[PDB]
């Protein structure tokens, strides 16, 4: 039907625009430098970690929850301990870091603008593998539910499905027309939707290797900055530019609502692991939590 | 009392007026990611010179929109590159994110240009100045940039041209004055006087 989600909470402690976030508590990375670990229910700022490099581009929360990673145009992925000084500084890239995610408490995968995805390790800071091939620079990746595979979206009209253990690609999907800057797996682990600069979320299927659906509407002509499925995957919350977010019916390819209330561009649109509520970043320095 | 620390953080953040540096490889970027914080007139600027990133700039330029002003240093003796530089300026003027922020333009290597002209663009034949030859070439290049500067989006932001040699040391005062003017214009804009 029609979804009428409304602002359950508003977190407004950041000094300037925010660039990313990630659920567990709720971490959020700013431009001023602070990397604040917000409280979701009480809204109290549990931690306010300053950063050596003001220019952040991402942030991660390991599933164990003991570490937090962040990196930006400095090219250095700084990993901090929360049990609050820097634990390590992974440094092997030649371009800005766009997205980093934790496989476990021992290693992290990074997606730099060097047209490569590195598979770092926390113990010694050495690239266990270096996935490469995408002609353009990566902008966003997403680990599979099993963690044995991870997909990455390049600035070319392409995406890839690298395997962490093997160290080699498995498939390539080039159904887009412009840059890819958002991906999130289907919760089952056999398909994934990729937002793009051409303003068309497209859902590729791994088993079939084809674009099953294309969430294209002629009315909207503004690019996508984030995508995210819900718990069951029926909904597809896509965070467009033009200061709005749209929820698509993932199967019917039909519109089902709107999330609005931002005075500037959206830059991350994650959801809770349990699916009890969704979050949303913003360039207005205003995290929001809808439900 | 995290808010207590965040208040001092707000004071420190608003105290520092950021910048950005952009130009060609041969252009004199150094003479005017690398961070170089410097203070003038008891106010601290914290500029940035991004050099480690690849040449594709449609990806990380978008996250330099809170900058107070972009410094654009341009070679003004390498004619072959000049057109390319102009195109870069176009892509900075017309962007949907960098529309608000102004640009401070430096035309580096004026002494080299004088030496070259004393010893590509067909519009130069039908051009007049707004020793004569060197000033004609300088002001022609300046007008070539200002034409695209004032072609569109004049109200939201304005460009500040400057001629800088490779030996002068007055750049800090020039950028200080330009930043003061820019902040004054934003303050007037928020008051609807302009």
């Amino acid at each position, epitope marked *: 039907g029609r979804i009428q989600m409304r602002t359950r909470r508003t977190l407004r402690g950041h000094l300037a625009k925010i660039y990313a976030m990630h659920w567990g508590l709720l971490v959020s990375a700013s431009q001023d430098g602070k990397l604040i670990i917000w409280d979701s229910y009480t809204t109290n700022k549990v931690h306010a970690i300053p950063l050596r490099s003001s220019w952040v581009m991402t942030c991660a929360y390991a599933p164990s929850g003991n570490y937090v990673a962040c990196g930006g145009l400095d090219n250095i992925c700084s990993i901090y301990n929360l049990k609050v000084r820097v634990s390590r500084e992974l440094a092997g890239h030649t371009g800005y870091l766009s997205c980093c995610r934790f496989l476990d408490d021992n290693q992290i995968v990074t997606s730099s603008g060097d047209t490569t995805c590195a598979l770092w390790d926390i113990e010694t800071g050495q690239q266990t593998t270096t996935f490469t091939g995408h002609t353009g620079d990566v902008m966003s990746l997403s680990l599979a539910p099993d963690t044995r595979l991870f997909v990455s979206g390049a600035c*070319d*009209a392409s995406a890839k499905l690298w395997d962490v253990r093997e160290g080699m690609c498995r498939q390539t999907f*080039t159904g887009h027309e412009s840059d890819i800057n958002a991906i999130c797996f289907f919760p089952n682990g056999n398909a994934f939707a990729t937002g793009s600069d051409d303003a068309t979320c497209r859902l590729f299927d791994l088993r079939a290797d084809q674009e099953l659906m294309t969430y294209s509407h002629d009315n909207i002509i503004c690019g996508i900055t984030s995508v995210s499925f819900s718990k069951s995957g029926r909904l597809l919350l896509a965070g467009y530019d033009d200061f709005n977010c749209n929820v698509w019916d993932a199967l019917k390819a039909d519109r089902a609502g709107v999330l609005a209330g931002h005075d500037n561009r959206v830059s991350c649109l994650g959801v809770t692991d349990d699916g009890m509520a969704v979050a949303t970043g913003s360039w207005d320095s205003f995290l929001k939590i809808w439900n | 009392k995290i808010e207590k620390q965040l208040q001092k953080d707000k004071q420190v953040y608003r105290a520092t007026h950021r910048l950005l540096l952009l130009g060609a490889d041969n252009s004199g970027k150094s003479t005017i990611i690398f961070e170089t914080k410097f203070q003038v007139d008891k106010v601290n600027f914290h500029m940035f010179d991004v050099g480690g990133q690849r040449d594709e*700039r449609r990806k990380w330029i978008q996250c330099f929109n809170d900058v107070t002003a972009i410094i654009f240093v341009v070679d003004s003796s390498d004619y072959n590159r000049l057109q390319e530089a102009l*195109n870069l300026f176009k*892509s900075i003027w017309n962007n949907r994110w960098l529309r608000t922020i102004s640009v401070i333009l430096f035309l580096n290597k004026q002494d080299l240009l004088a030496e070259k002209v004393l010893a590509y*663009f067909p519009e130069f034949a039908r051009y007049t100045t707004p020793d004569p030859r060197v000033t004609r070439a300088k002001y022609f290049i300046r007008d070539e940039f200002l034409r695209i500067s004032t072609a569109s989006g004049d109200g939201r932001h304005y460009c500040y041209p400057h001629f800088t040699c490779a030996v002068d040391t007055e750049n800090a005062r020039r950028i200080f004055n330009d930043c003061k003017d820019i902040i004054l214009q934003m303050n007037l804009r928020e008051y609807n006087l302009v």
Partner: nanobody
Amino acid sequence: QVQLQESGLRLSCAASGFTFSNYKMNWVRQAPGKGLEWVSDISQSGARISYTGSVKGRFTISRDNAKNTLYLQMNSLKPEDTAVYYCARCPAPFTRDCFDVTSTTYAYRGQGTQVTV
């Protein structure tokens, strides 16, 4: 699969896999032994046209959206015009800026025409 062909004086460019009308188009030449150079541009409607200063008024650029083709009409070629001509695409639709048309490793251009007079 965004793929741009090339042929060819009257240089011709065929584009496939995307809507031709939305994206601005450019001709850029890689001269032999030096970096790339931008040769001319044409927008969606064809109203706004511009060329490098060297080739001002000598070449002529025109696009047929119905056939989804682009054409550059080179007249009175000079030996300084020898180069490899590429048919580059603006990287986003409905925008007045093309940021990386002259990048060394751009993704939305593919061609080769070793023009030599």
